[PDB]
Structure 1
């Protein structure tokens, strides 16, 4: 009976880790977009 709860808790932990990784990826994404914008800003 506790096996299902263990699996559910593992699911929640995996979701939290996934959310953290997604957030850091989005941060890198914003950094790259801003850097590209700055680089293209000087060209014209």
Structure 2
């Protein structure tokens, strides 16, 4: 197909970029928390 096939990429790339925009926020949070523990540690 062409029309139903194009809707198969608009229902999976949105599902992955929703899973990648959450893990990018979560990794940016945990990077700033490792920099916290490295600073308080001797």
Shorter chain as denominator, the TM-score bin is 0.7 to 0.9
Unmatched tracts of structure 1, length 5 or more: none
Equivalent residues, number:
42
TM-score normalised to the size of structure 1? 0.79
> Deviation string for 1:13-38 (max 9, x for gaps)?
11111111110110110011011000
Unaligned runs of 5+ in 2: none
Higher helix content, 1 or 2: 1
Q: TM-score, normalised on structure 2?
A: 0.82
